[PDB]
Design a protein around this ligand. Structure first.
Ligand code: AGS
Ligand code: ADP
Ligand code: ADP
Lengths: 577, 577, 91, 95
């Protein structure tokens, strides 16, 4: 016979107990029993995006047939898993696959309607040699074959809904992804099975945490399989930490460590080390951003409102409109924010809006529509956020952008979603959009003297109201205003540049000190109201990197010696003492 | 049993010491024990480059099993390599090989999970013509086999990531290339094994030299395999030098001899030092370009200052300004610098920047937005850099463009990067940027005498300071002065062309010489104050070759005559003596 | 034709065989660089296509061979011209 | 037939990746096909036509020389083509 060859018995395996005792799913199984008890077209196909457990539905049906919870037309059935891969094995000759398939069909006709077939990956049945649909297809029509498909919706619309007769043979039992409490019940049955597997124990707050956070963070896989993967690798981690040298109980700290190994996101709560960071988040950000207190207050309040569960699950973490003097640390607050937010000065997406001066540049930023040249790789913003969900976007110099781009940002800052050219949505609810401009720079550099921050923000917000449309400036979470710098802040910037210079040259091997008079000459040589601290940057770079490295590479200076940077009338001389 | 017939044990070999104690890769073995102790996804397939010892990871796993360095789920587990040889041999009949693998899987089902299978070349078992692999998918589906695979990433993404059951019965183990010191420790253990084997000796500075020379040069083979090949074939070379016509230690000079005898062929004197390589870089730059050492040594000084690394590595390497006469050797200097510096002449990007004056022209030097014209061409300025990661960019006629292109160039000299129209990062921090103009063409062509390199440099530096941006000369490391040609350049280039012509005629069988007066006539027929060498090229070609090839195909010239290229009254004739 | 390879592939992976191979780089790149049990039993010996003068000496030995065969005479300028014209023209 | 005459007639119409193919030709004389191997082009006369200097020559070939005409139409083709392509020509003769 061929049923022993090519078909696997499920009801024997559910009778031995070698399957998942899946909990729930009763409405899909009731619809499958509706379809399997018809007269013609007895052919359900289970359509779901992967991971929703369609194999689990058919095996739960097999378990109900064994236990006897089925109507009086399914008692005694044998559910058989046909293998479409195991039939195209030796078919290298002519008419050899047809021998196997018709042997299977004659055996299933000889069984006299007591066998429910189950073709997992039903899209494989289309091409297996015309060829493989076109032998089953009258048996699927006349209802004598009680086939049960199990497919994915993308594969269904690609393979089967192009072939119309095979599409009308089957019946769609549309399977949705289960909820989080349903996933909890699933993981309770599997908690019994896993605690009998590893000889470990599992705690139910870890189960509800794993299911909820796996719905929250991993949007790539689907529930419940990603949750089961979390639970099982947590169990294996505990099982190896038993014999790597002491628990037997899995808690959600282990789930957080496993999920950090998966995706890297700060899933863990306050461990009283990053909480001391977050309570002094302002004092943290003043290690790199000296002064500019109001916006540091606002942005650290935005992150502290995000981490505390007070974050709105529709809007992003925060929109921001940076104004003020041109170029002081817009970029420095942004890069230090990316540093103390997730990693470093590299997990940001900078988009210079001065490039975006026409509408086809807006086509660049969103993406090309179908039937156009750059359709196949999408836009620039939305591809960047699909790469980097947990990031900070820096739209830089938004005043040079054509005002239509603010409509893209209307969508962005309304609901955290933006649809690119290829017809897909991007979630912005894990980003911090920050937009910089200079639409009040002369006014803020002039009338800052003894005018408070509130009325200054009011007046420059009126200016921006004359600039933009009211629709967009309603969407801004908080406009903040940078104030102009002072000379002690210039001294602080010079101290930070001397610290990184001493770090680089101590990694090189030198020990260099400086006089305070040289720092005063740098503060003289590095400021204007119209540019700010980039004159200080180029002044430090010219007056240090050019003469001192020339003195070092002249075979003159020795590593290890104290190199006191003495001053000159116009320059900086170095000594070996 | 077929366990002794079609499986090869590895635990017996490590028990009897018939394997090799592979050092390192602790994290991968730990994650493999994580994956092998689950209930789902229980089959890790090792994924890495060819020649990285994934089978060595399995051997170290089996050594930890035998020695007892495994958790309490692997003590008592055997590791059996499935014999691809006799099995893939026996694939003649439809029932001969199938019976073999059937009996093998019946034996593995009889072992009841107590025995772990090993399979190498997993894609070969998947693609074999249930031909081979879906004979095992009814076992790996039902969970009666806990085997471990090994394949390359391309075969895993094509043959396994495409499939549906096969994608989920397997797990990724992402092995990469080992580090330098890991290779050092592995080669120390193999030094012990080889000095016990070949009865020769191996030097440990020769080991770290072999690792460095292997990682720098051999690109196809990877670590550890190329280093092991160097060490052991050098040991065989020392063994042959015992019976050559003494020595027992494998020294680093022997490693350099093996490296030269392989397909890399370096000079070992080139691999002695980097500063001697800088001095020979200078000397070979004074070979293809004859005379005029000032700008060449200035570029050499700038290159040594960049390779000293005392400046910012967030900027590109080179920033010069070749001025004066156009096309007389700026191209040749760029080709010689790119040749002797990194690899060859193809590290050049010669772009006439007089083209990009319109707005969409500026869009084409970054790339067209998605859905539009020049998108598939690329950005024309970054596309040559992405393919040439260590290039020398030659911007010709940079002053004849739009000022925002100069802003883009300042962004290049600032950040060392530029995002193209296709939406990715293009790094510029390893290239040599050279821009040219003609502000000092006649300033040098009329004042070649009585003015040295420094005063002409200060004069044309004042000229460029009057003409161009202040930020333009801020970012140039040295505004150099490219030299006008002398007559020794003319004589050198003309004699090189005569050398290749005399080589081709000697291959035909003609020995021809030239008088000095004919070289004077060529120098007068080739020289012009704006072009120089290439009118000399076409003048040499015409005035020599065309009457000569008229005469050779006239039956006039016979090989075996002293042929001096004498002169006419004002022309050049070939005579026979 | 088990036939000739996959019985000798156990001789690879059993520590007995001392074989020497030779093939085209085409079938090397297409058939030999793929197999797993065939990698760590072999080693690339890149045979160089010979130079001019080595070809000249080989042709002088075979000049003796062919003058013994055809009962004609072969000139050595014709040999060096044959090797040079073959290298210059035929690809 | 390795000794032949190849007329790539009116080459300016085609797509610029074909000019990448011909850069391979003029660089080496060997060209990889789809099967994989390479074919020697070092005995053929690869001739190309165009008309990219049409109105330029029908305007200015009168009362001008021949050399600066070649220079000016070389500038026109430098607007059209790539500089490596006009670099790797033996000689661009202009009608
Ligand atoms: N109701 C359920 N109860 C218990 N486990 C379930 C349930 N539904 C799904 N699962 C688990 O989900 C995992 C795989 O689910 P499946 O439904 O088999 O995925 P799938 O239907 O095969 O989708 P693809 O495309 O074939 S991967 C297994 O670990 C099942 O145990
Ligand atoms: N608060 C600060 N602390 C330390 N350095 C800063 C601070 N603010 C500005 N800088 C320096 O000022 C410069 C301003 O550059 P940037 O932020 O790009 O200009 P813009 O203000 O136009 O965004 C930066 O290069 C940075 O090094
Ligand atoms: N830790 C190690 N110690 C010694 N030799 C090793 C080690 N890792 C790999 N090798 C060498 O690598 C070769 C095995 O190749 P392998 O790693 O199985 O191929 P792949 O690189 O495709 O996985 C053996 O010759 C072995 O000597």
């Amino acid at each position: 016979q061929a049923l022993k060859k090519y078909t696997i018995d499920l009801t024997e395996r559910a009778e031995q107990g070698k399957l998942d005792p899946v909990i729930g799913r009763d409405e899909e199984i009731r619809r499958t029993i509706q379809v399997l008890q018809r007269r013609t077209k007895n052919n359900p196909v289970l359509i779901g995006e992967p991971g929703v457990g369609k194999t689990a539905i058919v095996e739960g049906l097999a378990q109900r047939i064994i236990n006897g919870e089925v109507p009086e037309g399914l008692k005694g059935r044998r559910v058989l898993a046909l293998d479409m891969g195991a039939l195209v094995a030796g078919a290298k000759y002519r008419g050899e696959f047809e021998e196997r398939l018709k042997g299977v069909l004659n055996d299933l006709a000889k069984q006299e309607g007591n066998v429910i077939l189950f073709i997992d990956a039903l899209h494989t049945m289309v091409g297996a040699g015309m060829d493989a649909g076109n032998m089953l297809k009258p048996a699927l029509a006349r209802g004598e074959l009680h086939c049960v498909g199990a497919t994915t919706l993308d594969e269904y619309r690609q393979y089967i809904e192009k072939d119309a007769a095979l599409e009308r043979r089957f019946q769609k039992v549309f399977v949705a992804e289960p909820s989080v409490e349903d996933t909890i019940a699933i993981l309770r049955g599997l908690k019994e099975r896993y605690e009998l597997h590893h000889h470990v124990q599992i705690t139910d707050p870890a189960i509800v945490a794993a299911a909820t956070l796996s719905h929250r963070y991993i949007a790539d896989r689907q529930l419940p399989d990603k949750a089961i993967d979390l639970i099982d690798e947590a169990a294996s981690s505990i099982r190896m930490q038993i014999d790597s040298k002491l628990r037997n109980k899995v808690t959600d700290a282990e789930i957080a460590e496993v999920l950090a190994r998966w995706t890297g996101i700060p899933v863990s709560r306050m461990m009283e080390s990053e909480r001391e960071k977050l309570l002094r988040m302002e004092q943290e950000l003043h290690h790199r951003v000296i002064g500019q207190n109001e916006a540091v207050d606002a942005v650290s309040n935005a992150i502290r409102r995000s981490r505390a569960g007070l974050a709105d699950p529709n809007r992003p973490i925060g929109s921001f409109l940076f104004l003020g003097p041109t170029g002081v640390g817009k970029t420095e607050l942004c890069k230090a924010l990316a540093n103390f937010m997730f990693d470093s000065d590299e997990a940001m997406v900078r988009i210079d809006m001065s490039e975006f001066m026409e509408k086809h540049s807006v086509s660049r930023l969103v993406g090309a529509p179908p039937g156009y040249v750059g359709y196949e790789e999408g836009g620039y913003l939305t591809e960047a956020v699909r790469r980097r969900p947990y990031s900070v976007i820096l739209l830089d110099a938004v005043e040079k952008a054509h005002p239509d781009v603010f409509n893209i940002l209307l969508q962005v800052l309304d609901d955290g979603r933006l649809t690119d050219g290829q017809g897909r949505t991007v979630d912005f609810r894990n980003t911090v959009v920050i937009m910089t401009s200079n639409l009040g720079s002369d006014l803020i550099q002039e009338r800052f003297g003894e005018l408070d921050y509130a009325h200054m923000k009011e007046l420059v917000l009126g200016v921006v109201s004359h600039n933009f449309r009211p629709e967009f400036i309603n969407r801004i979470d908080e406009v903040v205003v940078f104030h102009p710098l002072g000379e002690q802040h210039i001294a602080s910037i010079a101290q930070i540049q001397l610290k990184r210079l001493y770090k680089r040259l101590e990694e090189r091997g030198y020990e260099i000190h400086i006089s305070d008079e040289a720092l005063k000459l740098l503060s003289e040589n590095g400021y204007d109201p119209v540019y700010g601290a980039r004159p200080l940057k180029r002044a430090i770079q010219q007056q240090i990197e050019n003469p001192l490295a020339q003195q070092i590479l002249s075979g003159e200076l020795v590593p290890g010696k104290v190199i006191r940077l003495e001053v000159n009338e116009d320059r900086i001389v170095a000594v070996q003492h």
